[PDB]
Amino acid sequence: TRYSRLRVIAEIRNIVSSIEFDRDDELFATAGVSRCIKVFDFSSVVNEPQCPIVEMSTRSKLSCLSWNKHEKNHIASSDYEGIVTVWDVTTRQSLMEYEEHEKRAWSVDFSRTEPSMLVSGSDDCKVKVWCTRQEASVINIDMKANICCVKYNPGSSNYIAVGSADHHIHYYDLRNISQPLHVFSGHKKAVSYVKFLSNNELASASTDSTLRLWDVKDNLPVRTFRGHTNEKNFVGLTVNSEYLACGSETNEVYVYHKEITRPVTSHRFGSAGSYFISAVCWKSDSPTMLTANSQGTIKVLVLAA
Amino acid sequence: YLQIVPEI
Structure with missing residues (x-):
């Protein structure tokens, strides 16, 4: 009962598909169906009664953003044409345009530990690994079903989690892609998000209205979280060392503690x-979170007693 | 369709 509610501390008044903090939790960026990446200063948003500091127009609707973990000013996007772009938010220019995917790319992630590396997944049933110093993909994994989400392990660039429309999470060692290390079954519908709480703890979301927690050291199911409604849309998943937060088709944000199957608030x-x-996006391991909904409204929330 | 999860 440490926390019982989420307090609204700021509000910026369509669909925002991605909201993410930069390397220092100083700026955050939004992107979605309006074909624009907007960058805001977090402290200005919290202190003031609102305007982005940078806006970049895009050719296609956006599905996902990932800031670089080393280069403060670089951010990757994935779009509905399949293009994976690396941008510089100071110059506004595209640095790289990766165009090998043949269909909508749903997800991109920059590695924390090898920060020139990024991974994408697509409706074309491929996972591609890219390096910012090379125009062609470094690794290609041909899979059997649409890829909805990809994420690097936070401790090593050799491991990625892949959430698939086949209902499973495929956990790969990129040093040998002939077979995954393990495939986690449990979800009853497509896996829409994968996010790591730590090196060995992986969380997932699915259109079966559940979140699930998994142990990627010993390849075990841990826990299933229920309460929210998610049968159709990408509604967001964000995790930190202790908490999971997700959206809902009831226009509600849910928070779970990783040890408790029903919501804290x-x-x-x-x-x-x-x-x-x-x-949704936590501000690192703090109780502060960014959230956005299908109308394009953004709220800064804080877990509170 | 916008931000709808694929269902195969």
Whole structure:
């Protein structure tokens, strides 16, 4: 009962598909169906009664963002055409445009430990690994079903989690892609997000209205979390050392502690409409979180007693 | 369709 609620500490008044903090939790960026990446200063948003400091127009609708963990000013995007772009938010220019995917790319992630490396996944059923110093993909994994999410392990660039429309999480060692290390079954519908709490703890979300926790050292199921409604949309998943947060098709943000299967708290986003939460992001291991919904509203929330 | 998870 350390926390019982989420307090709204700021609000910026369509769909925001991604909201992410930079390397220092100083700036954050949003992107979505409006074909624009917007960058905001977190402290200005919290202190003021609102305007992005940078906006970059894109050719296609955006599905995902990932900031570089070493180069402060670099951010990757994935788009509905399949293009994976690395941008510099100071110059506004695209640095790399990776165009090998043949269909919509749903996810991109920059590695924390080898920061020139990034991974993407697509409706074309491929996972591609890229290096910012090379135009062609470094690794290609041909899979059997649409890839909805990819994420690097936070401790090593050799491991990625891949969430698939086949309902499973495929956990790969990129040093030998002939077979995954392990494939985690349990979800009853597509796996829409994968996020690591730590080197050995992986969380997932699915359109079976569950989150699940997995042990990637010993290849074990750990826990299933329930309470929210997620049968259709990408509603967002974010985790830290202790907590999982996700969206819902009821326009509510849910928070779970990793040891407890039902929610610690929830927040009705408000504005009538069938809105859905569409993106969430913790501010590292703190109780502060960014959230956004299908109307494009952004809120800064904080877990509170 | 916008931000709808694929269902095969």
